[PDB]
């Protein structure tokens, strides 16, 4: 079922990027209605200007130029109880860099209890010119090779020592 | 079926107090809103019934003119008890006394019938 996964923090310039904000209800069985707000403050500047609001099925987008155009909803569709809210940007630009805060509003319907809750997920992304390979990927690949080389060296090493001994035994008798 | 225990005939001296004792028994635990008890009197076998006391949330004594203020409730229903007391019995009190008990959730309605006879 639903799992919470943190969004990627580096977006290549001039390429599409997807921001992931996923919020999971404590109990899957319960049914509630959700809506979301994403506010972004550009790097080097204080505060957040709400950029988009998604309620019902239609997505409302603020008129600011930084994000004018370039945004599409990648969230749960037709559910009306979103669970997963994600924003996808086409044609990523430097202007799209900084801190992103996404707040979720959920109406939970219980037997005689109606509960309104707020959870805040904030995503911070920095634009870079060229995709940078993750350090974990690089360390592991280099690390894996060393093991492959060391083991083989060890295996070959025994044979030179073991084999010579075996050859020696035949001659003695 | 509600279990009802009453004396079929109750003989009481004129001027004494007559406790009309009936036992109602059914499964479950009695509920105040749920438990309802009704008592009616008849001068004779074929005679019209006159309700004189009810339990609906609490005891309601209808204060029928024929009894003056001589009727009292005399039972703790939670105990399956719904007895009534007729103080200072008079000859005109002779007749048939009916106890009807309907107890939710029990669908069945209990009925006890006492023939009260007044001595001399």
């Amino acid at each position: 079922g639903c799992v919470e996964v943190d969004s990627e923090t580096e977006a290549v310039y001039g390429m599409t990027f997807k921001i992931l904000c996923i919020s999971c209800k404590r109990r899957s069985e319960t049914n509630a209605e959700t809506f979301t707000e994403w506010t972004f403050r550009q790097k080097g500047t204080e505060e957040f200007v709400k950029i988009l609001r998604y309620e019902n099925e239609v997505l409302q987008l603020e008129e600011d130029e930084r994000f004018e155009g370039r945004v599409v909803w990648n969230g749960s569709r037709g559910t009306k109880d979103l669970q997963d809210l994600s924003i996808f940007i086409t044609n990523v630009t430097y202007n799209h860099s900084g801190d992103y805060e996404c707040h979720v509003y959920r109406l939970l319907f219980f037997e005689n209890y109606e509960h309104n809750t707020s959870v805040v997920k904030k995503i911070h992304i920095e634009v870079v010119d060229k995709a940078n390979r993750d350090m974990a990927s690089i360390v592991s690949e280099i690390m894996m090779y060393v093991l492959i080389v060391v083991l083989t060296i060890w295996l070959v090493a025994e044979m030179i020592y073991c084999y010579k001994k075996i050859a020696a035994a035949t001659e003695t008798a | 079926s509600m279990e009802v225990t009453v004396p079929a005939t109750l003989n009481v001296l004129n001027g004494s107090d007559a406790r009309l004792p009936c036992t109602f028994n059914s499964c479950y635990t009695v509920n105040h809103k749920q438990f309802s008890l009704n008592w009616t009197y008849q001068e004779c076998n074929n005679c019209s019934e006159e309700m004189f006391l009810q339990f609906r949330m609490k005891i309601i004594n209808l204060k029928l003119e024929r009894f003056q203020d001589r009727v009292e409730f005399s039972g703790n229903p939670s105990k399956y008890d719904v007895s009534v007391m007729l103080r200072n019995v008079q000859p005109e009190d002779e007749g048939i006394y009916n106890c009807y008990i309907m107890n939710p959730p029990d669908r069945h309605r209990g009925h006890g019938k006492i023939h009260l006879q007044v001595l001399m």
Binding site: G1, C2, V3, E4, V5, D6, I22, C24, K25, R26, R27, S28, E29, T30, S76, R77, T79, Q83, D84, L108, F110, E111, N112, Y113, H115, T117, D134, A136, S137, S140, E141, M143, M144, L147, I148, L151, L155, E158, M159, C162, Y163, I166, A167, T170 | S1, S26, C27, Y28, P105, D106, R107
Partner: protein
């Protein structure tokens, strides 16, 4: 003179028969349940016959001598009781007629006296019970210790409920509780999981949980199950544990506590089920079986025109043609059954007719041979043979079908047995059935008599209550499916209890009939009823049973493979390789870093294994390498991994296979089997028995097929019903009687669905699955309700229309499960016996090293006397030694421990402070006295004290006990964390364990358990590996299935920890039916094929019906095979210890 006449009357052929005939008739009358008024006179006559029968015996035997002859026999005491009782009732009697009347059932017991040889069987049964005295003591003690551990660890836990956070009008949790008492009222306030009887159980820890947001967890109110399921009091805890031991609906207790308690406590259940249930039950079987052999064997040892007909008639006899004509017919019979196997709910009109045409030909051929058969040997000669008469009845039935209960028609399939004569194993099954009504007929008859008495007794005692109460038990105000109101129904409940299904029904009886009465009756049926069933099973089973530089290189590689570091290094890789498997699952997306290393890590593993395999080829060569079973397994695994790696590097991946192939990885732990010596030994034993198992399976399959075919004709296509989708409640049938009517409702109504069961009798293959559930008793009841309810193929089912179809299930259970299981168990244990004989009479469940150790444990059995010790010279030292040495002093300590044990029992939930303080203080005195005893033994004994093993255990217990009290105290001062504290107190239970030292009988049994630990460990290791492979297959395959029944948050296949919890639960095959059900549904509207699943790539939550069925079924069978193995190990050791 009169005495002679009476005496003459007393011993007569007819009189015994006359007394007996009336009694059987009397039994039919008890079954009335509201007999007419006219029947009362008949009641008087029965009273008359007994007095007359009773009077003569007393008149002749007594000689007016005090009835010395008459009352000397024990059975006669029973008759006197019955006569007075019938008579006493007319006389002034006690208030409860039903309680008093129940005695009349005693007359049924008289039947035991009248039938010849029955008296002997009952006596035989009582003798067996005597042997069970030691096991009973241990069982009570064992249940008692667990009850104490359970109570301390889980008391008050079942209470948790989710209480909502915001309350209007300044209400308080305390204020709310007293004022309201209604399910509707309660629901508004606490969570309640969509129609469950009670509130959802919540938990404090991260592992357990969880309550929806806006609801908080607090503990208040009654425990679930009417308050019956709770760990609050010792008595209640004892009932909960007893249920676990007999494994009745044990899965729910397990699921419920884990949820409130948290998953970490799953450990408690593993130890209890593994030691408490599998082991304790086995001990009972061994003792009953062992006891039966001595008595059975001991008793056995003491004994030791006209002329034309003849011409034509002679020709017919030549026509018997045993070499070919007789043989030819059997091929025909096998073919016929196969023909019958083809049926389905939906059958085309042309196909339906073809089946009819085909049947007639077969019916005709069987009759012609019979008519033809008659001419050749003559009628008298013809009916001489039993099979012939058997064949004749079937043929006659078919002829009648054409013109003159069509079900009987379905009956010709039995004919299939005829093959029994040719088959060695089938002959055995035929033999087993015969023994029950043959030599063992008297014993089997007793079972029938006992079931009858209980059904009637239950009916008399609780029949009235169920009707009046109904509501306490049912929301609707109508009788539940299982009730004690009628004899057939009362009988069904008793039969259910024979299978271990007692708890579900008992809660119902208790609500209506009260705790004291319901508990006593059910407990007796279970203990007494089961003992008879156990005796029949065991009795039946036992009786039935009896340059050339290349050469140097080749030599060297051989050196490398043989070397220990390499063998050792390879094993480490296997464990490590297997472990990486556990990490993958739904949560892998999170923790992206671990995912990257694991992906890379596998490549190094693939290279190492491929490298290792090459060394194997050079060292062994191809011929040696491929003639080994293990290597093929090993060679095959590397290949699957190798193909994925080559395909993966290349790209061109994810196109089904190879992608399906990736799922095959779960097989990686499989190479581990060869490496471990312990695991391999167990596997060798199973391979030895597969051929033997195969033979029994064939008989089971053929036998089950007849039941399955029979079932298909009766219920095929009749399980459909129109149900309200919101609550899944079938419509009344007053409206929407047929399928056609149901559809009209849908057109004008949104949520009404016409739907099938999912496990049913639509086709022969499905019938096999339905039968499997009934055989195991899991998921069986849903099916039975469907069968009885059913009316016709396209018609809505009426409630309990068939009612007598229950009989079909009862017959299958007796034949399908009781007999085959008898056969399955008999062959497997025997095969194991042959294996033991072959390998020099040595246990086949232990590695060679284990064998040396097993012998050392055997040495502990010896009683050679240890040195007495010398009193120290000092008198002061000596008197203490003198006092300590005395046996009387030791008995006092034993009494003291028992006193200590009773103190623990008094503890209960919400006891109060004054109560709590006294218990704490009494406990301190106990610690001081016990510590005091230890010091005293030490002063006198000195170095000698340390010599005894028991003294050391006693000394260790004291150290643990003082520390436990102090640490709890330090913890209280330090504070923070209640949970560490409860576990700390568990130390006191240590003193109770010392009781074992005192009882000689219990110790022998305990010693036996210790002896089998080495064998049990190997099986446990093998079992764990199989469970592990399955968990991995499950994680990939079943995560994402829609959550329905048995699958919910927790107890789901989403992660490895979760998968393990489920697999352990199903090992006992409990709830296996529930888990399988979500997997079965495929396609709308059962499920959505493409579902978003936020945070993951995968789409849809549809179980694979084919893959799911193979997986659950295979697991059930495999676990069962290993468990059969566990019983064999316990029995072998038990015979040896008892034998010594």
């Amino acid at each position: 003179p009169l005495r002679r006449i009476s005496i003459k009357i007393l011993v007569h052929s007819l009189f015994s028969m006359l007394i007996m005939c009336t009694i059987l008739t009397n039994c039919i009358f008890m079954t009335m349940n509201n007999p007419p008024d006219w029947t009362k006179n008949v009641e008087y006559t029965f009273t008359g016959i007994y007095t007359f029968e009773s009077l003569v015996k007393i008149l002749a035997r007594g000689f007016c001598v005090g009835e010395f002859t008459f009352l000397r026999d024990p059975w006669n005491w029973l008759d006197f009781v019955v006569i007075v009782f019938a008579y006493l009732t007319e006389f002034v009697n006690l208030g409860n007629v039903s309680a008093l009347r129940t005695f009349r059932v005693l007359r049924a017991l008289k039947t035991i006296s009248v039938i010849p040889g029955l008296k002997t069987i009952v006596g035989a049964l009582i003798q067996s019970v005597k042997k069970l005295s030691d096991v009973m003591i241990l069982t009570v003690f064992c249940l008692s210790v667990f009850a104490l551990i359970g109570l301390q660890l889980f008391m008050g836990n079942l209470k948790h409920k989710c209480f909502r956070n915001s309350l209007e009008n300044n209400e308080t949790l305390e204020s709310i509780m007293n004022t309201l008492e209604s399910e509707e009222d309660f629901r508004k306030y606490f969570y309640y999981l969509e129609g469950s009887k009670d509130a959802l159980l919540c938990g404090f820890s991260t592992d357990s949980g969880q309550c929806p947001e806006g609801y908080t967890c607090v503990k208040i109110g009654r425990n679930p199950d009417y308050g019956y399921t709770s760990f609050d009091t010792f008595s209640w805890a004892f009932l909960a544990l007893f249920r676990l031991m007999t494994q009745d609906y044990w899965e729910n207790l397990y699921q419920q506590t884990l949820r409130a308690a948290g998953k970490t406590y799953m450990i408690f259940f593993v130890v209890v089920i593994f030691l408490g249930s599998f082991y304790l039950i086995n001990l009972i079987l061994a003792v009953v079986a062992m006891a039966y052999k001595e008595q059975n064997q001991a008793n056995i040892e003491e004994a030791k025109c006209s002329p034309y007909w003849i011409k034509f008639k002679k020709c017919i006899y030549f026509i018997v043609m045993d070499p070919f004509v007789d043989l030819a017919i059997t091929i025909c019979i096998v073919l016929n059954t196969l023909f019958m196997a083809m049926e389905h709910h939906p059958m085309t009109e042309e196909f339906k007719n073809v089946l009819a045409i085909g049947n007639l030909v077969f019916t005709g051929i069987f009759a012609a041979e019979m008519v033809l058969k008659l001419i050749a040997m003559d009628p008298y000669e013809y009916f001489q043979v039993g099979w012939n008469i058997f064949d004749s009845l079937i043929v006659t039935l078919s002829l009648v079908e054409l013109f003159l209960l069509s079900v009987l028609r379905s009956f010709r399939l039995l004919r299939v047995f005829k093959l029994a004569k040719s088959w060695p194993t089938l002959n055995m099954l035929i033999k087993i059935i015969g023994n029950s009504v043959g030599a063992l007929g008297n014993l089997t008859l007793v079972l029938a008599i006992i079931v009858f008495i209980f059904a009637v007794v239950g009916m008399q005692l609780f029949g009235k209550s169920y009707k009046e109460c109904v509501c306490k038990i049912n929301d609707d105000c109508t009788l539940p499916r299982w009730h004690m109101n009628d004899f057939f129904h009362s009988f069904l409940i008793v039969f259910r209890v024979l299978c271990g299904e007692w708890i579900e029904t008992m809660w119902d009886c208790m609500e209506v009939a009260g705790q004291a009465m319901c508990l006593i009756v059910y407990m007796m049926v279970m203990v007494i009823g089961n003992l008879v069933v156990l005796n029949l099973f065991l009795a039946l089973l036992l009786s039935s049973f009896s340059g050339k530089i290349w050469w140097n290189i080749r030599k060297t590689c051989y050196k490398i493979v043989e070397h220990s570091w390499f063998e050792s290094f390879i094993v480490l890789m296997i464990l490590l390789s297997s472990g990486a498997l556990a990490f993958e699952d739904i949560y892998i997306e999170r923790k992206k870093t671990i995912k990257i290393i694991l992906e890379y890590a596998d490549k190094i593993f693939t290279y190492i294994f491929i490298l290792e395999m090459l060394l194997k080829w050079i060292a062994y060569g191809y011929k040696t390498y491929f003639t080994n079973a293990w290597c093929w397994l090993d060679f095959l695994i590397v290949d699957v991994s190798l193909v994925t790696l080559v395909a993966n590097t290349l790209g061109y991946s994810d196109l089904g296979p190879i992608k399906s192939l990736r799922t095959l990885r779960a097989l990686r732990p499989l190479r581990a089997l060869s490496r471990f010596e312990g695991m391999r030994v167990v596997v060798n034993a199973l391979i030895g028995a597969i051929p033997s198992i195969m033979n029994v399976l064939l008989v089971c399959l053929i036998f089950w097929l007849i039941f399955s075919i029979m079932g298909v004709n009766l219920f095929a296509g009749k399980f459909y019903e129109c149900i309200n989708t919101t609550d899944g409640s079938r419509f009344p049938a007053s409206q929407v009687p047929n399928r056609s009517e149901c559809f009209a409702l849908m057109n004008v109504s949104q949520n009404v669905r016409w739907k099938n069961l999912k496990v049913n009798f639509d086709n022969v293959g499905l019938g096999y699955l339905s039968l499997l559930q009934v055989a195991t008793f899991k998921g069986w009841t849903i099916i039975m309700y469907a069968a009885v309810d059913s009316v016709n193929v396209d018609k809505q089912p009426k409630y309990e229309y068939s009612l007598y179809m229950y009989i079909y299930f009862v017959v299958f259970i007796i034949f399908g499960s009781f007999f085959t299981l008898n056969l399955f168990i008999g062959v497997i244990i025997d095969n194991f016996n042959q294996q033991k004989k072959k390998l020099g009479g040595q246990d086949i469940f232990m590695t060679e090293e284990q064998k040396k150790y097993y012998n050392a444990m055997k040495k502990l059995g010896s009683k050679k006397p240890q040195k007495p010790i010398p009193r120290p010279g000092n008198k002061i030292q000596g008197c203490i030694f003198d006092l300590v040495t005395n046996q009387a002093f030791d008995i006092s300590i034993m009494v003291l421990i028992c006193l200590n044990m009773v103190t623990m029992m008094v503890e209960k939930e919400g006891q109060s402070q004054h109560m709590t303080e006294v218990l704490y203080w009494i406990n301190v005195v106990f610690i001081i006295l016990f510590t005091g005893e230890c010091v005293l033994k030490l002063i006198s004994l000195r170095h000698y004290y340390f010599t005894v093993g028991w003294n050391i255990f006693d000394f260790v217990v004291v150290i643990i006990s003082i520390v436990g009290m102090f640490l709890a105290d330090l913890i209280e001062t330090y504070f923070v964390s209640p949970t560490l504290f409860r576990v700390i107190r568990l130390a006191r239970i240590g003193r109770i364990l010392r009781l074992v030292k005192g009882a000689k009988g219990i110790r022998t049994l305990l010693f036996a358990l210790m002896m089998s630990l080495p064998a049990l460990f190997n099986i446990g290791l093998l079992l764990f590996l199989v469970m592990f492979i399955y968990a991995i297959f499950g994680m990939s395959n079943f995560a994402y299935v829609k959550k329905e029944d048995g699958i919910n948050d927790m107890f789901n296949f989403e992660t490895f920890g979760n998968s393990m919890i489920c697999l352990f639960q199903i090992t006992t095959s409990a709830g296996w039916d529930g888990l399988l059900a979500p997997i079965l549904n495929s396609k709308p509207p059962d499920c959505d094929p493409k579902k978003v699943h936020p945070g993951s790539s995968v789409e849809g939550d549809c179980g694979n019906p084919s893959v799911g069925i193979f997986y659950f079924v295979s697991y059930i069978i495999i676990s069962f095979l290993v468990v059969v193995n566990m019983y064999i190990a316990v029995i072998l050791e038990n015979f040896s210890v008892a034998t010594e």
